[PDB]
From a paper:
Human immunodeficiency virus type 1 (HIV-1) envelope (Env), a heterotrimer of gp120-gp41 subunits, mediates fusion of the viral and host cell membranes after interactions with the host receptor CD4 and a coreceptor.
The crystal structure of unbound CG10 Fab showed ordered complementarity-determining regions (CDRs) on both the antibody heavy and light chains. Comparison of the VH-VL domains in the bound and unbound Fab structures showed that the conformational changes came mainly from the CDRH3 loop, while the rest of CDRs remained similar when bound to the sCD4-B41 complex (root mean square deviation [RMSD] = ~1.5 Å for superimposition of 235 VH-VL Cα residues). V2i antibodies elicited during natural HIV-1 infection that exhibited CD4i antibody characteristics were compared to CG10, a CD4i antibody that was elicited in a mouse immunized with a gp120-sCD4 complex.
Author numbering:
A (entry chain B): 1 to 27, 27A, 27B, 27C, 27D, 28 to 214
B (entry chain A): 1 to 52, 52A, 53 to 82, 82A, 82B, 82C, 83 to 100, 100A, ...
The structure:
């Protein structure tokens, strides 16, 4: 098979600047003056989108901020100027001989200004408490960079092993992330404690932010 | 316009086969190869095989020999892929895509189906409960949402106000809980001044269970 090695695996590029992604093939993909290498963009929930075909041809409808170069075994995809909407994973793919093979992908992060999260806490709903389980949700909205620490405290005791986090893909309009953390307790354990707190640490915050509620106090 | 429309989400048992479809419109179906591609987290994109409906020609990856079978029904412009001897390694999103001739190849895939998600499992389908994430009683901007709990298999989709509210919405990737069931939250930030005058409804769809829930999220009056 023709093996394709992409580099880097992940790349962060400043808004407005140039992103360059490399793809190296284990054998030449040239024939009769054309280089049989393609580039795709993929965002979560969507199929891949063809950007560049035969190394340098811009697919109709794709912005000319995208360009491709190279021949033989060495190819590049260039994006300039980078915009918020370019956050995505990019793949090379060769069409020279079967099996058709893809590179491993490169995730592109768009580097924007630091933005602190806005933090919100949600108690379990009365509807859910009818069922014997309690989900407590902490939301961190529209922050950058991605690194963030969320710690749960119940009656000031730090929790471990009973929460799960989910982070959005980078936003295609403002280049921020958002994060949800869900603390799961049995109803029996939930009613044994009073203070439920989410503590958030992030580069954009001068000191950790804590959001909390007292069970039943509403 | 060239369009490829794939069949819906599948939940199928290990050891069996699954047959999914890709219906084409906007071009002469018998004149173009349809390629099939597998996407599984941690494994990028992997090509399975190609099918030419104008003659029933096949081309497979050696890794799918004896595993994938490609066919078509030209009377309905529909291509099919069957995957046999299913295991958890076959849980993935599967795409169809149309190739076109440029130079001396056709593997330039410009048009893609939306994908078919396949889960290989013997566990039963379970539609979710939907709970409100009510806007706090304690500013300029308030956050509210819906918690979609305890469903299987993926996926769930969420809209707000039937698609009229899109700004400020974040629908999070689902998490696989240790119960073996998925959960996800969808949130939106809105003007706190709108909480008494604007209605907020999350529209939750879990097609595998035909569970469709419209949940009104109101401020908690305490």
């Amino acid at each position: 098979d023709i093996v394709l090695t992409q580099s880097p695996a992940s790349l962060a590029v400043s808004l407005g600047q140039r992103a360059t992604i490399s793809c190296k093939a284990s054998q030449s993909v040239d024939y009769d003056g054309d280089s049989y290498m393609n580039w795709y963009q993929q965002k979560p929930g969507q199929p891949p989108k063809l950007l560049i075909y035969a190394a340098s041809n811009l697919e109709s409808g794709i912005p000319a901020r995208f360009s491709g170069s190279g021949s033989g075994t060495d190819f590049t995809l260039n994006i300039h100027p980078v915009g918020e909407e370019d956050a995505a994973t990019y793949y090379c793919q060769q069409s020279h001989e079967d099996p058709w093979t893809f590179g491993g992908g490169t995730m592109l992060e768009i580097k924007r200004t630091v933005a602190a999260p806005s933090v919100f806490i949600f108690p379990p709903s009365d509807e859910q408490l009818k069922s014997g389980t309690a989900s407590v949700v902490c939301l961190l909205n529209n922050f950058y960079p991605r690194e963030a620490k969320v710690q749960w405290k119940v009656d000031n005791a730090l929790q471990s092993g009973n929460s799960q986090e989910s982070v959005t893909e980078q936003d295609s309009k403002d280049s921020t992330y958002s994060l949800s953390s869900t603390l799961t307790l049995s109803k029996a354990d939930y009613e044994k404690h009073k203070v439920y707190a989410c503590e958030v640490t992030h580069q954009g915050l001068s000191s950790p932010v804590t959001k909390s509620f007292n069970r039943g106090e509403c | 316009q060239v369009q490829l429309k794939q069949s819906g989400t599948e939940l199928v048992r290990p050891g069996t086969s699954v047959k999914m479809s890709c219906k084409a419109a906007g071009y002469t179906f018998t004149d173009y190869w349809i390629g099939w591609v597998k996407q599984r987290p941690g494994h990028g994109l992997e090509w399975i095989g190609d099918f030419y409906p104008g003659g029933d020609y096949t081309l497979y990856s050696e890794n799918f020999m004896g595993k994938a079978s490609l066919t078509a029904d030209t009377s309905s412009n529909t291509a099919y892929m069957q995957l046999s001897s299913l295991t958890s390694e076959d849980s993935a999103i599967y795409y169809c895509a149309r190739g076109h001739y440029y130079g001396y190849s056709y593997a330039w895939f410009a048009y893609w189906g939306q994908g078919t998600l396949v889960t290989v499992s013997s566990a039963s389908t379970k539609g979710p409960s939907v709970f409100p994430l009510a806007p706090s009683s304690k500013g300029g901007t308030a956050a509210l949402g819906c918690l979609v709990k305890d469903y299987f298999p993926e996926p769930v989709t969420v809209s707000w106000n039937s698609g009229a509210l899109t700004s400020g919405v974040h629908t999070f990737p689902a998490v696989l809980q240790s119960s073996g069931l998925y959960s996800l939250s969808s949130v939106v930030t809105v003007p706190s001044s709108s909480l008494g005058t604007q209605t907020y409804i999350c529209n939750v769809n879990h097609k595998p269970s035909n569970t469709k829930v419209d949940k009104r999220v109101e401020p908690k009056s305490c």
